[PDB]
């Protein structure tokens, strides 16, 4: 196996004080795909000068990210004391197809030093530490987040100047505050800037050595080091796993001042990663050397369709999350928004299913439920819909009545009633869009305003926020064409709005300042 150096000889571990309330801050730093945030450059080829639509692993628009806060440890003001951390080691998430991280989001801003809320300092970029693997469980004292067999550890070291990527069996040490000993909370890594971040001589093993206080490294299959240029530049970094190994991606080597993420390394981990968590970290600084650190944000990746805009230099400088809203689905299909009108039919509202109705001679009350949209199973006949109490149509005693298109019309139940089936009803939608003012209004058609509200629980798209900006202050207005939000009654007559609604109605654009 791989020689990763000796075990720590310390008889005990540093005590770790986990105080989550001090890390309980709100500072979302979301992905805005319109500037291609979080977009990982597609692999295997390149393009330039083009907009394409592509399905692949991407973060989604508006993902704020899980915020990970690293902090100064306890100190007497002369010397460091105990570590001070967030409860991150137990925060085990599904790996699935991977995830991405925003690093240094708050860099160069000034803010809290966390351990002492009234104290602020210039915020520095710190690289995230992770523990990943195929299986997790409990520790011998009942703590969570134990990884089994070989565990992948991503542990930045040297005060953020090297990445140590390794895969070893982590053998817990039994000493005081160690994972197999007395008074264990959570292992956490640390460095001590007073001795570890000396200019020209960083302790490149400071975080490795602290890690080693809690676990011995055994049967290592690998340990690789990557160097990191020290800067405060906003950085994209991320990870995925494929049949060929574990792919480490960053904007750091290819697009440092841009953000497109590119693969820079692959680790030989063929055991599907199912679980991961953030390694808590604390800096053993003193009060007079107490710094603030940027939180990092973790966003998940998933197979999403995006429009990706490639500049002449081949970098993605804009992207569209096609399913984000109704207008965005249209932009992907229609390439852009000023294309013709932007006045197009949009994806409809599904229905929103209710608990089922089941009957079959061969838990309550599922005999019937009237009604809205309920799943059902009746004598082997399945579907979803709303039942209505209605008069019988024949033939009697044959139970299930079907229409001209061979669909179920209704059913004779064992309670003696006949119900008409209307399946589920839905809300059709269309959007009136003005490419000049960059605004819109929407119709629900035939649904009518008695069933319309500014919010919806149906649903047709992930967000309705572009309309809410104005529509949140108006009720729906009912017109002969259909029910509309964002209409404003002005009682005007115009020849052509370039947004006619048909009939004798027209949606008039407002006037640019």
């Amino acid at each position: 196996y791989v020689d990763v150096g000796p075990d720590s000889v310390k008889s005990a571990c540093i005590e770790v004080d986990i105080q989550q309330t001090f890390f309980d801050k709100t500072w979302p730093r979301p992905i805005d795909v319109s500037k291609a945030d979080g977009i990982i450059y597609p692999q295997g080829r390149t393009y330039s000068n083009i907009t394409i639509t592509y399905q692949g692993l991407f973060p989604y628009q508006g993902d704020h990210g899980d915020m990970y806060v690293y902090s100064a440890g306890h100190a007497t003001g002369t010397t460091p004391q105990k570590l001070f951390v967030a409860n991150y080691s137990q925060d085990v998430k599904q790996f699935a197809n991977g995830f991405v991280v925003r690093i240094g989001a708050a860099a160069n801003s000034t803010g809290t030093v966390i351990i002492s809320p009234s104290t602020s300092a210039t915020i520095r970029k710190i690289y995230p530490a992770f523990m990943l693997g195929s299986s997790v469980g409990n520790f011998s004292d009942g703590k969570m987040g134990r990884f089994f067999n070989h565990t992948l550890v991503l542990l930045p070291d040297g005060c953020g100047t090297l990445l140590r990527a390794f895969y070893c069996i982590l053998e817990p040490r039994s000493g005081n505050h160690c994972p197999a000993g007395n008074s264990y909370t959570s292992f956490a890594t640390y460095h001590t800037p007073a001795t570890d971040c000396s200019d020209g001589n960083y302790n490149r093993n400071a975080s490795l050595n602290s890690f080693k206080e809690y676990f011995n490294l055994r049967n290592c299959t690998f340990m690789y080091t990557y160097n990191i240029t020290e800067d405060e530049i906003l950085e994209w970094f991320g990870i995925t796993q494929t049949a060929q190994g574990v792919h480490l991606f960053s904007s750091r080597y290819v697009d440092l001042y841009g953000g497109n993420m590119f693969q820079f390394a692959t680790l030989p981990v063929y055991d599907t990663i199912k679980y991961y968590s953030i390694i808590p970290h604390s800096i053993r600084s003193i009060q007079s050397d107490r710094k603030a650190w940027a939180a990092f944000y973790v966003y998940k990746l998933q197979p999403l369709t995006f429009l990706l805009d490639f500049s002449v230099d081949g970098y993605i400088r804009r992207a569209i999350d096609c399913g984000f809203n109704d207008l965005s689905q249209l932009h992907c299909s229609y390439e852009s928004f000023d294309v013709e009108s932007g006045v197009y039919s949009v994806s409809s509202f599904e229905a929103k299913p209710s608990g089922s109705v089941v009957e079959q001679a061969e838990d309550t009350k599922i005999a019937s439920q009237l009604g809205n949209c309920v799943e059902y199973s009746l004598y082997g006949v399945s579907g979803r819909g709303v039942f209505q109490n209605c008069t019988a149509v024949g033939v009697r005693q044959q139970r299930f009545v079907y229409d001209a298109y061979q669909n179920l019309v209704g059913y004779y139940s064992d309670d003696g009633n006949y119900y008409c089936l209307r399946a589920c009803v839905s809300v059709p939608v269309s959007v009136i869009y003005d490419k000049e003012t960059k605004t819109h209004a929407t119709l629900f058609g035939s649904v009518a305003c008695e069933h319309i509200s500014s919010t919806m629980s149906q649903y047709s798209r992930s967000t309705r926020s572009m309309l809410k900006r104005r529509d949140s202050t108006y009720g729906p207005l009912q017109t002969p064409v259909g029910c509309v939000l964002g209409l404003v009654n002005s009682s005007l007559f115009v020849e052509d709005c370039k947004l006619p609604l048909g009939q004798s109605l027209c949606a008039l654009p407002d006037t640019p300042s």
């Epitope: 000889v9 008889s11 005990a12 011998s140 039994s174 197999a180 000993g181």
Partner: antibody
């Protein structure tokens, strides 16, 4: 009052195994580290192993690996030290103590005399 | 582990007099002192260079840092005839020095 009570001694031949024990009281066994040490007359003391009774976690002195096993039975508040394949160089007084890791050894058993 | 050297090898101190016993580490501060009376296991006297152990008389006062540690027994009783040892608990394997004989 904390007490550590060891078993009496024994005479064995080389190749023999011996099992030592140390029953303790006056403290919670499961909250303490119990260390085992080897000492010969005229010599300093050498630590063999410790066990945290509360987790069963252990640590050993490499000169005894493959020969020594430290274990506990918390239901009887007892620490044990098992040795196998003893040689004449293992004739010693074996001691149990309350302490281990970073904890100083405040309480000791009387010592168990094993002659090989 | 850490190797410890003690000095003096032995010392005679009369009743009512102070006994100074020193230890020097080969390297570097959780140094503990023990007293092993003839026929007894070692008892802890000092821990973490200067603190008193459990049930330990004020007569036993320690100090030290780095590689250099000491114990001052004052007054010495005839009943303090014992081996005095330094032990290092900072690192594992835990170790004891050769010992100083106080008479």
């Amino acid at each position: 009052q904390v007490q550590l009570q060891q078993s009496g001694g024994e005479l064995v031949k080389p190749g023999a195994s011996v099992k030592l024990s140390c029953k303790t009281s006056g403290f919670t066994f499961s909250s303490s580290y119990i260390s085992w040490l080897k000492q010969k007359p005229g010599q300093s003391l050498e630590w063999i192993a410790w066990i945290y009774a509360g987790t069963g976690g252990t640590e050993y002195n490499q000169k005894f690996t493959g020969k020594a096993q430290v274990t506990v039975d918390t239901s009887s508040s007892t620490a044990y030290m098992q040795f196998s394949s003893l040689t004449t160089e293992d004739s010693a007084i074996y001691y149990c103590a309350r302490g281990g890791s970073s904890f100083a050894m405040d309480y000791w058993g009387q010592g168990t005399s094993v002659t090989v | 582990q850490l190797v410890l050297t003690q000095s003096p090898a032995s010392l005679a101190v009369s009743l009512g007099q102070r006994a100074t016993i020193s230890c020097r580490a080969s390297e570097s501060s959780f140094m503990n002192w023990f007293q092993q009376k003839p026929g007894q296991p070692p008892k802890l006297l000092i821990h973490t260079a200067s603190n008193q152990g459990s049930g330990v008389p004020a007569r036993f006062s320690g100090s030290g840092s780095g590689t250099d540690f000491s114990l001052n027994i004052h007054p010495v009783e005839d009943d303090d005839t014992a081996m005095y040892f330094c032990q290092q608990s900072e690192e594992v394997p835990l170790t004891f020095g050769a010992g100083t004989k106080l008479e």
